[PDB]
Scaffold this active site. Structure first.
Site: not given
Ligand SMILES: [K+]
Ligand SMILES: [Cl-]
Ligand SMILES: [K+]
Ligand SMILES: [K+]
Lengths: 411, 411
Positions: B163, B302, B313, B334, B339, B398
């Site tokens: 990612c 993220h 996060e 996202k 994603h 990940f």
């Molecule tokens: K981002």
């Protein structure tokens, strides 16, 4: 700019399951090429390979841990642990955020993809392993090394085919030069002896179809006909100089130059006359702040394909002029085969040891001189010589040209 | 050497549109790109929704013969890179080719090609494997094909960090220009992960949301979030040394000023407790930018819609920003794009750059149930018009790969 030194080495190669054995075999011209055992050779035009011998992963970790790693990750973890132990580096909570990992692989877990896809076809997607994705992806070598070491600093994975190991080390060198880490565990790993890799490199005729292991890998020979595929991992510990000196680290040498260029020509064919390779060598020389005449030895990419060896020789002549006939060049792939993503890692180790021990490893198997490949390839026998600067090339498929320059360490 | 690096071109293919303008206008209007899976038959899989490209016909951009020699991940990278270079109005003239590089990553590369070629190997044998299989499948082919298409002969690489791929690639390209090794870098991420093995793999380890309702499946920070929604596409930008951009009269979107990279060294797939690694990556990017944390106006999170990513996060943002965590704006795009894996950082860097250029913060859509642990300002439902000076973008991948970029308004 920070100075960056080499403080530890770790390796698994077709020449031995540690650095000392691999290097001692290389300096004695021992071939690591033999008949293919990993897959059924009857199915392919290629009949030989450079495999690890006598490697039992359970000698380094629990069976339960190894079962959750593809071979490319097993080799990377084993070689990284060997490098950190060689460096006598204690990765404590205090230094962990300053110790990073930058290890690449060209293919990652191809064996895992193949076996899991067969399970998908026969048992369905609901029987694919929960570990499939992490085991296949090339960044898992860096991911597993980081967990094994407790390295919490700058972390990456470069995937640039044959240039992988050289680009990874160069990129790690740049991280330390700019002050973003004090230590980087870096190099390349590959376990490419699989059904699809042999099918793929046979389909585009890149592999040698020579069934004789005594002559299959013969870089610069008139009768060369393709590369011999190998496996393993070459990992080094790079460290900021003041950090190395303060802990009393042993120093093998210094990394001083890195060059990266692209051919922008063709998906697999190297550019005419090695123009891109010449530019990468020139960028590394300029990065090191030296004159080309200061290079004593070139550890060639020298894969034993017709076009690589011819064009790499042309690139060396372009860069070095009259000095091209004065320096020594050798291809250790004559003994190890082409380790793909790990080639740059093992070759950086051989370049560093050539300086530390004052020994140039030979190119074995040159029986028929090629008029187009007329440099000094250190044929057959190692040469004992004091070396100041060594250049290592990786001129990868896809136009990825990478070069590193190493220097004898001076206070 | 510390050169200033600016953004002079943008190119994208995403589930929100087949160009930057369409993708951006849909993001600021809270348009969802998620629907039922069409790429594979989802009947046998627990995941039922995905974020696919809409109406993307590769034959509108190249001949069918050229498309047949590219996996979807390479088709997306070449199409997005050509749009970015056209947007930058960059003519790569002879003296500039060696100073123009390419650094585009992919998390999986040509997984669809690997699956189809291995199925051919199993059913028809190795002679039926394409000579183009190896170059088509490897992740570095996106950089390789973009370099050939553009004639870019400078520094080239490919980062593969799950990612974090797109964010690491842009950060690494930024460092190349900052140290003086290229004048222009075409960089970002690409991914075509909607394949049988990718869906099987991310279902097997329960990372994907099993929510069959496309209206609520991707809901970052929502109490009922239950996993990510997989997407596809490519986000590519043109980075350029400032004096060079000015000399060629380039338009400037903004400046890249900070990059942080850390590793969790914790677990193969599970994020580290309390987002500690992510907090360290944000702190490294802030330190690199030479700013106080209070200078950040907006964070493009993220925010994958997994329970642990969004919780950790949020915790990491509170650790880094203290009281300022409740003053800045955070959003996860996202919620609309899904994603994009290796391309997430690329598209999110484009949205971060445009948020600064246009003075508009895109929203997090689909938050219906507040989560007491996710209590920051997620810019719910509607875009916010605001003058922005600094934007931070995270990719907490990940495998413990944490990457952060900081963008700044250009005067
Ligand atoms: K981002
Ligand atoms: Cl889930
Ligand atoms: K051949
Ligand atoms: K070499």
């Amino acid at each position: 700019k920070k100075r960056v030194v080499v403080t530890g080495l770790g390796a698994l190669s077709p020449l031995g399951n540690d650095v000392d054995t691999s290097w001692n075999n290389a300096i004695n011209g021992v071939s690591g090429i033999g008949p293919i055992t990993r897959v059924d050779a009857e199915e392919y035009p290629a009949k030989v390979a450079a495999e690890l011998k006598d490697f039992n992963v359970e000698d380094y970790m629990d069976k339960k841990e190894a079962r959750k790693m593809d071979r490319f990750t097993q080799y990377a973890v084993v070689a990284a642990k060997m490098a950190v132990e060689d460096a006598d580096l204690n990765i404590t909570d205090e230094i962990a955020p300053r110790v990073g990992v930058w290890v690449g692989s060209g293919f990652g877990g191809l064996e895992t993809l193949e076996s899991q896809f067969e399970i998908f076809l026969t048992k369905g997607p609901r029987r694919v392993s929960p570990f499939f994705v992490p085991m296949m992806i090339p960044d898992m070598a860096t991911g597993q090394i980081s967990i094994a070491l407790g390295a919490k600093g700058v972390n990456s994975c470069t995937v640039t085919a044959c240039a992988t190991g050289t680009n990874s080390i160069g990129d790690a060198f740049k991280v330390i030069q700019r002050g973003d880490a004090d230590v980087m565990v870096t190099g390349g790993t590959e376990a490419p002896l699989t059904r699809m890799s042999f099918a793929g490199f046979s389909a585009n005729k890149a592999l040698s179809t020579n069934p004789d292991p005594k002559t299959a890998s013969r870089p610069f020979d008139k009768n060369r006909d393709g590369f011999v595929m190998g496996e393993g991992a070459g990992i080094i510990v790079l460290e900021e100089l003041e950090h190395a000196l303060a802990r009393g680290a042993k120093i093998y040498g210094e990394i001083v130059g890195y060059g990266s260029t692209g051919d922008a020509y063709h998906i697999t064919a190297p550019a005419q006359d090695g123009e891109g390779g010449a530019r990468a060598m020139q960028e590394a020389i300029k990065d090191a702040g030296i004159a080309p005449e200061e290079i004593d030895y070139i550890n060639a990419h020298g894969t034993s394909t017709y076009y690589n060896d011819k064009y790499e020789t042309m690139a060396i002549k372009t860069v070095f002029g009259e000095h091209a006939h004065k320096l020594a060049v050798s291809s250790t792939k004559s003994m190890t085969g082409h380790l793909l993503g790990a080639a740059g890692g093992i070759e950086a180790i051989f370049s560093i040891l050539a300086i530390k021990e004052g020994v140039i490893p030979p190119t074995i198997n040159i029986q028929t001189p090629d008029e187009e490949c007329d440099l000094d390839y250190v044929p057959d026998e190692a040469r004992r010589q004091e070396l100041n600067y060594v250049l290592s090339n990786s001129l990868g498929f896809g136009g990825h040209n990478a070069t590193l320059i190493f220097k004898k360490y001076q206070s």
